[PDB]
């Protein structure tokens, strides 16, 4: 009858394990190709990560070197967020960095070279006058910028006036070859570094903020002869094969989803002819697999990210920002679908189901508590904002005070209070104590309670019955 | 009959959602105006916070500058809680700070200026004699204070004798204009800094404690001409409109509360004529909304805080202490009432109800455990007080050892024990180990147990019935 | 009958609240005097703590001063666990400390004085010969000690040979008066400091370990004249009244306990004549109050500690070690009995009862897990002991790795591995990962489960019935 | 009948406590010898640990000394992972270390001696040419190594060219005797230190990485005469007796296991003749003791580790790596079997049983969550890898981010983001926030729920019945 032929069709359709689709008929495809995509996208990613980590592992190191070469009185180990005050000493930095640039072949150990050359930038106001003692100023909302050009060879001349001075900057390129990357592996060895020292006077507070910033561009050498004999990049293959596995599993997943929707509306109609039951929300949403939706999102994202990787490796742009993010979130989604395949196995399916049933209420409670904690933020930002250093901008309030829910670096935040106004000090202790109490002895225990109860209910389900369903009646 | 006309009245009165008051009749007021107050009080606050954060962001920076200008041998990065020992070196600080004051136009990068000028304070005893080798002293409970006045222009003379010397102090004003605040935004640019270096000899221990303290006052410039053409503060509006929204929602909430109380005592009397039941505590407290009480507290507090903000911005006092606290706690209460509006929505009402039912027992247990932990405090303060540095005053004992319940910076407090008396060392390990065990493996699990059980009981309630109530009988 | 007259007697005896003993008859004694003892022993303790904290607050400060005076190249802020290597530099420390001693009236700011004077100690072997290049030595298990005496007034001579040198030491007394203690409060102002610099060569490793140690003795000044007119210690009273309140509550508690035991064996016999039931363990232990046992322990301990305080304050010894411990643990026990008084109140009695029922199983599980964790200790001590710095002696293994259960300073212990032998590195990661997993995802959840279940069972008890008891039958 | 004679046999076989095997018949062996093995293997281990800790306690100290002697500008306290930049300064290190080697008898306090002598290593390329400015290089995959030999006695000559220079190295031996070890205890006093300074130029980045590494070999002195009269190692005994106790308990445990297996298959057959039930998996695995399996593993491992200890102490090799690991994991297994003996006692058996029933599901969930967290790792490694310092290699990602589940050093990882690309910054906050939320408010609560429920189920079992078993029927 039409009824049992459904029972055959939808029971075998809905049988969770493709192990059962294996156990009648002969087909093993949909899991095999998807494990292929797992190992493919993860080897893709890991390979990407090691290459990019070599580029970075050279960049941070050279930036360290340049910091100790061009920054006067920079301790051989390190310093951080450097600062200057007296004017002649700013002059001594600038003169020092210049004389270090010109003599760098004598000075430096590293092989960095001029490229076949410096330059100097000053940004000053169109019209300065400021009389801080007379209570009278005029301000210009315009900056005129003047430059020099100082040559690699052939003591200095220069001019500076602080009051009109907004920022001073040094820009130039040092070009260096990375032995250990090209030598063993096939990656480009040529680096164009743009070094910029910059002095921020924008605060006009007396602090001249010094930073040495490093921009980096990759190039391949015109002639490389190693071992006395005559790089070759094969990634050109495996990126492509990734894009193909991804196109394929995308097509298949989408096809199965659409078939499931056609059988969705078909089933609705059939149940209308016979029993005239509707229930299109619950059962319509049952017919959605919901995991193949993840596999589609992941799969689109690996297509886009693999394409961007292929184009950036083609032009050698080296931003590697958007590409990396896409590739990483996609592979994380794949590794999350492995839980899917663990659902069939035997026992894990309980524990997975209860993670699945807890998440939709968990997010709800996250809304509720988000209002509390978002409330404290606007409190302590304004009350403690002038006094505490870790409450400064709202963001630091939120990310610090969230680190304080998890109970980390807490004695710090208690210990660093200014204690000038005694009232704000006391408030600080009521604020911090009360809040930490509220999150650690309520809200954490509310997640524990919520999830515990969810877990026992799905344990009862797997022990005795499941909620009555039109579909379940009619398949059995 | 009088009975059903109640059932109509009190059922519609008590219907939790104003969504239902919407669904019969036509009125949407009480929620609309209150969301207005939400966005109003939070934009009020956030705006306040960004302005005040600009003032502070300039203050801390200039204080850094002055610290590195007037403190001899203050490392360009920073030092902390500075100290001096040899007497000639105290002289070298003082002479140094003076010669740095007089030459500061040559020296400093910042634009700070004398105001159209120094002064020097010495606080010495009326009669000193102390013979620490003879075992004999006489002490004076009186301080005579002598000052100098040193001019901005035109090497030094001065006198100091340590034994009679209680504190030395330098006070003076540097006046500076903040470009980046006035320039983009409408806020005052003029700062009067009172710099005070102070040397605390009060301990008479040999340590001369140096600090450089910064007092700051805001003023508007007499003539500001920017861009070659001719600040204006609009906050004058939005503060007022806040005070109005607050007055309005205050009046409305109070009115509804009072009506609810009149229907309270009315209902009591009516149930006396008919069935003669009393139960005035349970049901009398039912008639209290209890959320509008929060909205009143919040609303009064935003009235007071907005008024203080308006007056301080009027006179430009800049304490911004009491005002900020009021405004922040008020807005935190508003953000806490958003949970109220989340109670109607659908499912959250469970989870909210169980937070509500857990809090009243949670506070009880907080009493009980507060006695334990308050007991340990008086223990470790005296036993470990001489030895540990973080147990010093009782307060540090309580705030450290509370940071130790949450399990932070613990290996520190174990590792820093003096270990001179071996008995106190051993006690230290029994103390710390035992206490940390007791709070993390009992009391945290007691909050978890308490709240879990509360949550399951209100889950049963929402599943099957609620406690029998006179009101509930008579509305249904 | 004999039966109901028991029911009268034992029901009123066992009625938990003395509120009920109040509600029939007229007596309020046993709680009133005990609250007296609460406030008495805690004011006793707190007063002790503030005085002792003044003594310490001066000691640590002066020790800081001396450290910066007598230790060459000791940064004005601080250094820690100082060290020396080259021999001429050890000489430069010693010569420096001497020339700093002799000139200290010129040098130092603090008022410390010679007392109406130095001395120098050298500890050398009876017979040294060590030939580390010849592989041959002879060792003497005897030390001969030679001293000098260097005068406060009137460049140096001295002799040192490192190989025979075990330790060098400088001992002497500086005598100083503390203004701020005597002046406001009644405490002695005279301090005898014994300063000892010591150089530990015991390791014979090339590191000469320098430390400056401070011994301190309190004395009262012979003539103190303050304000031009003519300390007085009243503690002589309040210590005594403490000892009296303690004797009194001790006598009363013991008396009630003994009466309870006489009615214990009486009841056993009476139930033998009538029903011939034994059950002497359960009910015999019921007749023990069990809280008055705490009050006795506390009370004895406050007697001993108050006596030791009175004697030490009499002789002014200032060890303040054993005394402090006794006084502090006693007062902690009192503050723990306040939970007792919270048991009667109303609702807390549930939560208290479940703490009481959980503790006896909690200790059991503590045994079980103590075997695991004590096992890991003997593992990581030997495997990681040479490599990690925080696993050194077993104790540091146990107190660090316990800090690691609570999840603190963890990334440190992962990050500091030597990584010389790769096998020990890998083992280190299996060790740390596995252990941290085991305690945080098992044993903490086992305490949570144990206590939760205990709490629900006593909740059922207070809801419906208690275990059948001979006593409970026969009182009702 | 054959049936009751089983019931006698298997009931007494399976009676958990050997207390019951005591209570009929007379034998106490199997527990007595095993407690012997407990105290034996733990005294073995602890003794090992104290000896090895003396060796290490001398090694780290001397390494400190040498670091401060041979490293120019190494602060007397310490520095870490030292670095150099300018070429003449590398020369100044090298010249300095040489002049410190030659003069070390004058210089150093420690007794270290030349052994009856330096050497110097340079590793340079076979053919260098690198033109970083011309974009052209040739690389040699070959290193030619040249050495000098510099004498202990009798300013320097040397040659260095950086571009061909891969590493420079100094190797030599200082020989020192440890007084405090031989003197009190019987251990060898002679140390051969191999000191190697090494300069890593491999990065060719401009950073010359300096390290001072210490290799150490133990020897016994040819002539030691102490106290004027004439070491002796007894460990030769107790190691052997350990190996014997271990052989014995191994033989016994294995014998009982094999007997249990023979009665296993016997019982299967007997139940086949009578009732013809199979159930060989459940009951076959019941007949395995499962604890004696642990005791065998432990016992084999103590045999191997004691043997390796005996051989290393024989030859005095001092690696002490594999040996230590074996000995430590074995003794940890023994200390874990003490839980076994706690199972019989009385009440602990519940709590033990539930640890035992929770572990097999716990590992399952560990698989599931391992997929998630292993997914995040491959995400944040690539996205945050260039920017964060603690995400560098994948391993640091995993061990840091695991330290972040437990909630430690979190505000660090939030605070150190580069913030160059704003998109990667934002992603960083979604990554970190989301992940920390997911593990602390889900997966920890899922372990809590899982274990709680397991605990209540075994509580019901011990209260009422156990699952029906063929064996249990037929023993009762």
Curated annotation (Swiss-Prot), chains A, B, C, D:
Q: What's noted about post-translational modification?
A: N-glycosylated.
Q: Where is this region: Interaction with phosphoinositides?
A: 20-30
Show the segment(s) annotated as Extracellular/lumenal pore loop. 72-86
Q: Which GO terms describe its biological process?
A: calcium ion transmembrane transport; inner ear auditory receptor cell differentiation; locomotory behavior
The transmembrane segments are 31-51, 234-254, 292-312, 322-342, 365-385, 426-447
**Recorded consequence of changing residue 408 to K:** Nearly abolishes channel activity; inhibits starvation-induced autophagy
Domain of life according to the entry: Eukaryota
- Annotated site residue numbers, Interaction with phosphoinositides: 255
Gene Ontology CC annotations of this record: autophagosome membrane; early endosome membrane; late endosome membrane; lysosomal membrane; plasma membrane
Q: Name one GO molecular function term.
A: calcium channel activity
Compartmental location? Cell membrane; Early endosome membrane; Late endosome membrane; Lysosome membrane
Residue span of motif Selectivity filter: 406-409
Q: Which residues are glycosylated?
A: 106, 134, 157
- Reaction(s) this enzyme catalyzes, per UniProt: Ca(2+)(in) = Ca(2+)(out); K(+)(in) = K(+)(out); Na(+)(in) = Na(+)(out)
Q: Where does the record place intramembrane segments? A: 394-414
Q: Which residues lie on this side of the membrane: Extracellular?
A: 52-233, 313-321, 386-393, 415-425
According to the UniProt entry, how is activity regulated?
Answer: Channel activity is activated by PtdIns(3,5)P2 (phosphatidylinositol 3,5-bisphosphate). Inhibited by lumenal H(+) and Na(+). The channel pore shows dynamic behavior and undergoes spontaneous, Ca(2+)-dependent modulation when conducting Ca(2+).
Q: How does it sit in the membrane?
A: Multi-pass membrane protein
Q: Which cysteines are joined by disulfide bonds?
A: 121-147, 190-221
**Subunit structure of this chain's protein:** Homotetramer. Can heterooligomerize with MCOLN1; heteromeric assemblies have different channel properties as compared to the respective homooligomers and may be tissue-specific. May heterooligomerize with TRPV5 to form a functional distinct ion channel. Interacts with GABARAPL2.
Q: What is known of its domains?
A: The most N-terminal extracellular/lumenal domain (referred to as I-II linker or polycystin-mucolipin domain) contributes to a structure with a four-fold rotational symmetry in a tetrameric assembly; the structure contains a central highly electronegative pore with a 14 A diameter. The pore is critical for Ca(2+) and pH regulation. The protruding structure formed by the I-II linkers may contain all the interaction sites with lipids and proteins in the endolysosomal lumen.
**Family designation:** Belongs to the transient receptor (TC 1.A.4) family. Polycystin subfamily. MCOLN3 sub-subfamily.
What name goes with this protein?
Mucolipin-3
Q: Which organism is it from?
A: Homo sapiens (Human)
